[PDB]
Amino acid sequence: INTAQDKWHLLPAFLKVKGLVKQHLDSFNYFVDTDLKKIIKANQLILSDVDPEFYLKYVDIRVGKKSSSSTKDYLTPPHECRLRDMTYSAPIYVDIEYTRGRNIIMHKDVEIGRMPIMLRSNKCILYDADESKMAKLNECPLDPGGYFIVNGTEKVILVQEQLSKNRIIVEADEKKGIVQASVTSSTHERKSKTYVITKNGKIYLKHNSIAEEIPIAIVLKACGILSDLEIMQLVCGNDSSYQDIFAVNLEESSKLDIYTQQQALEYIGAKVKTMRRQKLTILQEGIEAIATTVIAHLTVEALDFREKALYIAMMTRRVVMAMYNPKMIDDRDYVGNKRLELAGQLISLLFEDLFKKFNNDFKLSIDKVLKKPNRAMEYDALLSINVHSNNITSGLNRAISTGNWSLKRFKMERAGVTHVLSRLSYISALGMMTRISSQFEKSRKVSGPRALQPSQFGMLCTADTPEGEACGLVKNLALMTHITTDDEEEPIKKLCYVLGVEDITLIDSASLHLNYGVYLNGTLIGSIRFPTKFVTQFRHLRRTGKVSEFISIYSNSHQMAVHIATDGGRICRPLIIVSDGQSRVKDIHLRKLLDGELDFDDFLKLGLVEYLDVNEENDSYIALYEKDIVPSMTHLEIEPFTILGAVAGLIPYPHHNQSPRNTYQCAMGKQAIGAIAYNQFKRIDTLLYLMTYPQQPMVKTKTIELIDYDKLPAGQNATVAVMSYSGYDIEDALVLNKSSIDRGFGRCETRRKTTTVLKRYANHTQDIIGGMRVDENGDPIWQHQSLGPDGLGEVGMKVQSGQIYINKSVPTQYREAPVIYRGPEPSHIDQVMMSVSDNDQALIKVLLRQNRRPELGDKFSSRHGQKGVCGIIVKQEDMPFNDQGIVPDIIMNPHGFPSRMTVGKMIELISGKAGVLNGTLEYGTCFGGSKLEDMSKILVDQGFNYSGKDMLYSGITGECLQAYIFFGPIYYQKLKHMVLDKMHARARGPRAVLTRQPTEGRSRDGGLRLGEMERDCVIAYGASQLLLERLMISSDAFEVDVCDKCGLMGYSGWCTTCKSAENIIKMTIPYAAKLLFQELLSMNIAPRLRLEDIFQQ
């Protein structure tokens, strides 16, 4: 009943209590429940400099609930905040301790701004909604959540990835730039970043708060390490090859005659910038530069500079190993060297700086009453809070909506932090989640961060990436992943001494490179004698759950180190532990997992499964299947198809395709259209492409069962005859059936919103909606046929290319400025919504519906990256037919298979055909699915051929075709790229007022640019009057009046620099050349035209 093929049931057990948007949801839940306190406690008190007794301190904070209230506050529901263009938010109730008069007073539930809350988080009202409350609140239960509604527009904070923050990374190249970063970041106690560079074979120390860089022997002497033999024992050891490389750095310390820590600190005391405030000595400064200035996560607190000296020594040992062997460098693109910054981390950066700037702007106004008269008239100090509380709200809302990230305190200016959530498909809303941004999108290289690494097996999706300008810079996380939670490390440090390390202040610096040293987050801590006994007893404390999971330990060997990482932003991945050649999850546990008890995280507590970091996968050896478990294995895959993400699970049989093909599907599954939501008829969105009769795939995948894709599918099962037909399907065009389109095959529907705001003005005059304008009797004129009596168009009426559907008027004169439907095709009004936004002014949203069917030129695709356009529509007595009489809906060319090598499309058709003849949906999941040798058993069972090739007759001539036709159902999906929204053409139209050339863009009248590369083409033809006509005569021709003696251009046949109309010549010229000359005369150069006659005498 249970066997090796049943351990994949942990994957519905993982995703049940976790989900796929947990990296957005858990981070925002961490912020509003933990990190709000750790911002208030970082700056609690307000100190009034005038009269230093009127203090003000914040006791605690909570969002969305008053302390005296036993119930959470009423929020406007998330769908009403989409319609009314509001921001779905919650009030931040701080309570305050302040001084008033002569006694101190606590005041309860001060509202300081409002926090825009994420959907499906704790404070959202959709949290634990039983799908009948989703319907009352007009919400789709299949919506992922994880995003914000800010001014109606729904915005997602993307997963950012940075380089690993507080760890060391070794770079090198030719010309010997061996640099060593360490971007130190304690929150903003200090944000600093040191280097270590070898110039001329001499190791230095650059830092951006130093005037000029310090050599390396006179900075370890700046720390406690000054014996100058142990410096040759901290960076060289007994290795004679490394003692030659560092020996130049020794004598430079004697060459500056630096010999004591007093004299060593005074060297760097005169090398600093930003001497501001204290006027302390160079000893007091150089001993401060090692305190909290160079490597800022290692703050020293006392006389003992030992472990920080051991830090810089273990940096420069990695330099000397890089000088000796140039291949001992660190990959910048390795996934273990990355940290994923989630949405709670970003908002904790954002909300802190606005609470800095709140408290600064509240302190510089709390003294504007104290140093002013009415001294005896005290004030409560709680009436100026709302003066600045509209900067907390407006600064949170602006930074999410704009996406701009302007943090003055933290000094970061990131762009593109948010994005509008995609509502093209159901897949677009889930593919915009699980999406990861990168830092490389400002400067360019070749073949660096754009190549995928083998270290993203199971961590990142190996095919979901865009093609073009962002291929490998946008990436996607897989199904069974988890992002680590940052936790405290001094309990983990104190566990290390109990387990047998001995401290760095106890160990001799001579014999330090003979034993493995432990590294709690890159910082050297101790030195174990027996490392693999230490590591085994630390996994065993984690598998018993004493020390937490998401705490990874791995024993390197070439570095001879034992690293222990516990910081957040690492990507874990669950695996099954095996022991002594035997998988620990037995069939009794799968029997319990199925029938209700013993869920996932009981497999963690009972020691069965385990999260592995990328780094901890080095110290492992992982089996893929249970038949492959040899005794030296230590883990087992729960399920191998989770190498692909959420979007790449739509592909049927991905392992049979070629790999560029499975990447084109990921971009094109997000573009195919179908069903969006269950409130897709209750929502008024900017552009909403729907399908009339969407079908679920015949060949499906486990991965689309899990993400509930077959309840909101996007596509239809076409009957596809793979054959060459009509010569209109040559290079990716596809032949289409007319009688299929007449019945609703591929028929879609477009919906578009149009918002006007009837704004009232400061003149106490308001925008007004007009009235129906009748003529000659009680019937409207043409532009008011679809209008109705109140100026807003009637629901159900047909608007076409010029009519008015909102008749608004601005100012009592009223200047008529109605909206005019300017579309190439008509469209029916389906929804007119009359509401009022937050600031008490009217808001009309009119939705417009348009039905459209497949024309020549719409894009269809299969799920195998084979995009195609509709080339011809064929009459259905012209299509080929079998013995039963079935004709194809699509005919597909056999020439798209051999170059593209999509063999998994040739298996989708048989599994699709054998499944529909059997009555069962089949599976084409990755590394598995239904088998071709017993899909071909069902297919002979009926009386069809085993190979899916049928003998079709010819519809045109009646005869048997001389080949057997591969014939059956493929799932086709229709893309948003439709030729009605792409055909445009311009003869003459509006011109840009500066260049007086035709305008830009498509949604103007138009203008197609002929630029710099086709000019080259027509020069090569020698066609000189075409080039004169296509560039000047019919782009910007300009009759201008030159002067012959000056060479400048005059107006009206008259020269100005010589007051005469005498020798003025009239010429035609590009207006951009006229615009050039008058911009050169303003720069004080004079282009003087020298003219001559065209004709010989």
């Binding site: 239809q716 059936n737 079935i886």
Partner: protein, 67 residues
């Protein structure tokens, strides 16, 4: 969102065999492929009309004005 009236590839009327398809599965239960043949859907173009039909009119009708 609701069942197509006709099969796309034949024009055989399949819209009257959705109300009866669900009764063959719910009561007197069949294995979804002899409930198709009992309704008389021989051709595979016509079986895929109601086998892979996802019925979204039932979920869309949960969100109307209560009226």
């Amino acid at each position: 969102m609701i069942v197509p009236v006709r099969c796309f590839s034949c024009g055989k009327v399949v819209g009257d065999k959705w109300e009866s398809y669900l009764n063959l599965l719910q009561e007197d239960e069949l294995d979804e492929g002899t409930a198709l043949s009992r309704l008389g859907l021989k051709r595979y173009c016509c079986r895929r009309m109601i086998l892979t039909h996802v019925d979204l009119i039932e979920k869309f009708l949960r969100y109307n004005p209560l009226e």
